[model samples]
Target: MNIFEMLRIDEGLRLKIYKDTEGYYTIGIGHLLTKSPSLNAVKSELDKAIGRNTNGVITKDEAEKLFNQDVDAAVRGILRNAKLKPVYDSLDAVRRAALINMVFQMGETGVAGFTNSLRMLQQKRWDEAAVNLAKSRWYNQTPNRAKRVITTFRTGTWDAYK
Candidate 1:
């Protein structure tokens, strides 16, 4: 499946501000406003996106825009990371997407900790890499989402694409 569709399933849309798993003040499609730059930078643009504010609400268009930008940042982070770049370049699109998805869920540092999995992936040992990922606490904490990524890594296909 396409990156946006995968992200849409993983990160459900919300028009209003809410608390994330970490209790961060998040909005749109997982936009952590407190951690990000001031909302003023996009306040006027967000205002127009929704046409009017409904007590801290955003439109789907704005949320999708944020999702795109977030995904872009994730990919850029992956490509620039010294450890992940070579592995990322060695994989095909499906595997690359899975890596991007993992990095998106956790930070680049989080995924970078998967030294064994990364090595297996770079060696094209699909099952070994998948097993390594399955052994992660991330998989334990977020099974369904992690399952999709692991499955993608194992199959080298977009089996979870929907």
Candidate 2:
């Protein structure tokens, strides 16, 4: 499946506001509203999406649009991040999606902090990279998701559905 399809599953489709694992106020498919760079610009749209506009609701179309934008931002953030760019470029589509998924959950800067894992990934030491990921607090915080992504890194295959 494509990155979008895979992410929708990993992120899950939450149309309204909720706190993510890190306690950020988020909406749609992992879109962080609080501290969001575009909050001032997209607040109205977001308000409309959430119905702060019912009990807080957004249409599937609105959710999809937000999801796409968030995914795109993650992709750009990954590609532009100096530490992650080369590693990201070296992977195949599935592995790349796994990397993108990491960026989606944690910001590019957050993912960049995985120095050892990134090094192992860049060196094509797949199992080592997976081990590094498994050892992280990110893994402990979100074990299932991290497990799937780490497996993708190790196997170079789509494990988002596994």
Candidate 3:
């Protein structure tokens, strides 16, 4: 079976948010949430009793749309963060796409720790940026990915996923 189908069955599509075993708020198809308007917000926004529907199982389209929305907001936030903007925008589309993965995994705040590398990006010192990027924990995790990001940073070309 497809992964999403399996997830739906295993995770139990919930019509409303509920606390998981650890008492953290969770909803949708195992949407492990730390906080949301429906649960721990200052105001409750998703009360099913307040005209919200039951059998809240969303279709695949709806789930995908929600995931896209979350991704869009995250990318926008990463672009808005000054420490990440320079590196992200200085690259070509392929490299920018790679940066999206970088930001997605490490987060803007996490990437901010690469101060020297960010300065290199701002200075348009592509070689140094590539070198510095190579010296990151991300590189340690995926040696080949480092080469890909580094090469793109140095040359502004796609190399990782064809």
What is candidate 1's lDDT per residue for 1-162, written digit by digit as tens? Answer: 677787777777888876666665567876655543455644544565446754577777878887888899999999899999999999998889888888887889999999999999999999888887899788888788888888888998877764
Task: Point out where model 3 deviates above 4 Å.
Answer: 1-63
Better of 1 and 2 by TM-score: 2
Q: Give every collision pair in model 3.
A: none
**What is the C-alpha lDDT profile of model 2 across 57-122, one tens digit per residue?**
677787788788788888999878899999988988889999999998888888999998899999
Work out the TM-score per prediction: 0.83, 0.86, 0.55
TM-score of 1: 0.83
Error of 1 at 45 (Å): 15
lDDT of 3 by residue, 1-162 (tens): 222332343345553557654465655544544554343351133333233343434455554554455456557976798877776677566556556555544557877788998788767798878888887777886576457556766776544334
What ranges in model 2 sit over 4 Å off? 35-45, 48-55, 159-162
Q: With candidate 1 superimposed using the best TM-score fit, by how many Å does residue 44's alpha carbon deviate from the native?
A: 14
